């Protein structure tokens, strides 16, 4: 055998999608219990009682690399905290069809007085060599649709920002993750040409987004001309609003605020 298709964590309860490789024990139990803030996986509901009342954790292990409002942001390092970026990629592995230690791990969560609660994720390689800048990213069933995956696909491309480079996500992308790439794309490339003449290796260096992923939605917007083996921007203002109020592409509810980002490439 049986595995894991039932876990608890804080207050939702959530069915698995996938398989995912925790010890036989563990997916022989009829459900699966956790640490919401450090991700103990348990057998019993008396053993996660046990521990809800003796863990310190109150939020994720690495660096609060962002916050604003209710909403933080905190850095994992692979290495440092392999236990707790093991048990988040068991967890991810549910829900996704897609050793840690080569990775650092981003962790969205909103806060209120009991602690910072984890509501998704995106890991990414250290270093990049095919320059992909998400390996895996993924919003928690229960806040899905709700802006929290716009929002880490959002930061992953601030990262990059800051970080002189381009980047994109590791394939394959789930359903969900096609739909929101492409929306996130959109909707950042759309606002400079409302504003802004430009290229396409222009809306790159602004962006962090391969030209490659700015043509192919561009080109989903009709907005790009091919002119001897040239990609050209070509857009009416018109039809770029008209694209705006789409809600495929419109604003996402919740933005990241680079003034409130402190981090260090
Ligand atoms: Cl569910
Ligand atoms: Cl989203
Ligand atoms: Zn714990």
């Known amino acids: 055998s049986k595995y ?12 698995a999608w996938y398989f995912s490789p925790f010890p ?5 139990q009829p459900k699966l ?17 046990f521990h809800l009342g003796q863990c310190q954790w109150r939020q994720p292990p690495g660096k609060e690399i962002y916050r604003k409002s209710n909403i933080s942001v905190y850095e994992v390092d692979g290495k ?39 509501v998704g994720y995106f890991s990414k390689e250290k270093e990049s060599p095919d320059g992909n800048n998400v390996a895996c990213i993924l919003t928690l069933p229960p806040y899905q649709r709700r ?23 590791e394939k394959p992308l789930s359903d969900l993750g096609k739909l929101s790439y492409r929306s996130y794309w959109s909707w950042v490339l759309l606002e400079i040409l409302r504003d802004f003449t430009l290229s396409i290796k222009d809306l790159s260096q602004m962006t ?7 043509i192919s939605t561009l080109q989903s917007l009709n907005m790009v001309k091919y002119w001897k083996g040239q990609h050209v921007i070509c857009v009416t203002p018109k039809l770029v609003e008209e694209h705006l109020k789409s809600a495929q592409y419109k604003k996402p509810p919740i933005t990241v605020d680079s003034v409130c980002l402190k981090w260090a490439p």
């Open 4 to 15: 894991v298709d039932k876990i608890h964590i804080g207050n939702y309860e959530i069915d």
């Open 24 to 28: 036989e024990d563990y997916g022989k």
């Open 33 to 49: 219990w956790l640490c919401e803030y450090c991700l103990k996986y348990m057998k019993y509901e008396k053993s996660y009682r």
């Open 80 to 118: 440092d905290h392999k236990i707790y970026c093991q048990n988040l990629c068991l967890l991810a592995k549910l829900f996704l069809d897609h050793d840690v230690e080569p990775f650092v791990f981003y962790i969205l969560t909103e806060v209120d007085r009991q602690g910072a609660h984890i």
């Open 147 to 169: 802006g929290y995956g716009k929002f880490l696909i959002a930061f992953s491309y601030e990262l990059s920002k800051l970080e002189s480079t381009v980047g994109s996500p």
């Open 208 to 214: 962090s987004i391969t030209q490659n992923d700015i």
